Structure 1
């Protein structure tokens, strides 16, 4: 029903397939995107992304990532997506120290210290994200890279502040208001599109990915907040407190798929 899995160890990514057979599929995510192989679509339109987040929006340390449960209405359309998609949550992937590789996707082999993902469902076709997941319905995902910067990105302040409040597995916190738009790259023009999967079990191959080409800046000081996060792991009859680090899935084969590039 929901098998144990981790980002390393006996239940690490190489082994997910043993309990979650779809992680062995041929339409898996994430991937390295080679620009020269991507083919050349309505314009990407965001709706609601500039509105201030409400005080009900909250952040949770899930043990696998830090998640932001969105409580406002944010919608995306265009970019080949079938209809309108509404945002459900945001999740993060990071390395270990010093801006080490933390992204899931890469572009021309280039990885990034963080990857932020936003997950969407079609609110018209389905009444909730969880049902969509259930029916293996199509869901939308944006991948945004963060890139090292000499000074703090103020736009990230509320998120970094929130991280400080959820150091341990299961902690939750409300966040200071933030502008979802400002966690996306300054230029939305260049992005890639392909069909792939969840990058965690059950690895369902239902994801329309929007991978933005240009990164969002983050300082080494801000990154420290990600590296300061902990999780817990299980061994036979033991639970342990562990650093939450390098929480990314290794990359997967393209196979029959092509990447589109705006």
Structure 2
């Protein structure tokens, strides 16, 4: 079904075509640190493959709703109270409008960030692929990483930024220079929140175990410009403010590592 981030098919209307979009365990949310539970004693968050440089096969696409990176190498995450070892499928981005304006989907203590990067995972021991996991409505994993402005370019982002400059128009695709996925994550890996929620776009399936890192990754204002310069096709407009409104926590509790 068709959907958008504004207008007649904007987020307030998604439920018309996608019933789950009106569920009670939806994402994203505001995380209030003082309402979060401490002491859950999760197993160490373990990353497998994140220090390897990515393959020249990895590519990026302007989908018109976001820019997505299709990961062609094997990256795995486990621990942190995830039900199993999850394999990375793709990375998507959400950002604001100009000059570092709020773009993240999640927030912490009411604070939003200029970009949120999300990495989506599936359990390869249950399914051959991410698409099948989704369609079967089984548990998928997702990490959310915030970016925060810094006076100098973050060199770890150079391949991603260069990629954005190659997918300015809707449907454009490009291969990416090698990047190190670990370096797109916060230096402080042990500091995160966990909650159960949903995909943040239709079908909004309530099957996502979220990891939201507490600390942001630096990006320069100049680097942010590469995000703001992306187009989408409604007529051509800039692809900006591509984030879902926050959703009610309801009976859920967020856990703090």
Deviation at 1:251, TM superposition (A): 0.1
Deviation at 1:241, TM superposition (A): 1.0
Matching residue of 1:259: 254
* Alignment of 1:51 onto 2:46: no
**Equivalent-residue separation in structure 2 for 1:104 and 1:183 (angstroms):** 18
After the TM superposition, which segments of 4 or more aligned residues of structure 1 sit over 2 Å from their partners? Answer: none
**Equivalent-residue separation in structure 2 for 1:15 and 1:52 (angstroms):** 41
**Equivalent-residue separation in structure 1 for 2:131 and 2:18 (angstroms):** 18
**Equivalent-residue separation in structure 1 for 2:245 and 2:161 (angstroms):** 26
Matching residue of 2:13: 15
- Structure 1 unaligned regions, length at least 5: 234-239
3-state DSSP class of the match of 2:206? Answer: coil
**Equivalent-residue separation in structure 2 for 1:184 and 1:153 (angstroms):** 12
**Equivalent-residue separation in structure 1 for 2:186 and 2:119 (angstroms):** 13
Deviation at 1:163, TM superposition (A): 0.1
Matching residue of 2:78: 77
**Equivalent-residue separation in structure 2 for 1:225 and 1:186 (angstroms):** 23
* RMSD of equivalent CA atoms: 0.4
Deviation at 1:19, TM superposition (A): 1.2
**Equivalent-residue separation in structure 2 for 1:169 and 1:136 (angstroms):** 29
Deviation at 1:64, TM superposition (A): 0.5
**Equivalent-residue separation in structure 2 for 1:224 and 1:84 (angstroms):** 36
**Equivalent-residue separation in structure 2 for 1:186 and 1:148 (angstroms):** 16
Q: Deviations over 1:199-241 (max 9, x none)?
A: 00000000000000000000000000000000011xxxxxx11
Q: TM-score, normalised by structure 1?
A: 0.96
**Equivalent-residue separation in structure 2 for 1:137 and 1:21 (angstroms):** 17
**Equivalent-residue separation in structure 1 for 2:106 and 2:49 (angstroms):** 26
Deviation at 1:146, TM superposition (A): 0.2
Q: Deviations over 1:85-132 (max 9, x none)?
A: 000000000000000000000000010000000000001111100000
- Structure 2 unaligned regions, length at least 5: none
Q: Deviations over 1:165-192 (max 9, x none)?
A: 0001100000000000000001111100
Deviation at 1:242, TM superposition (A): 1.1
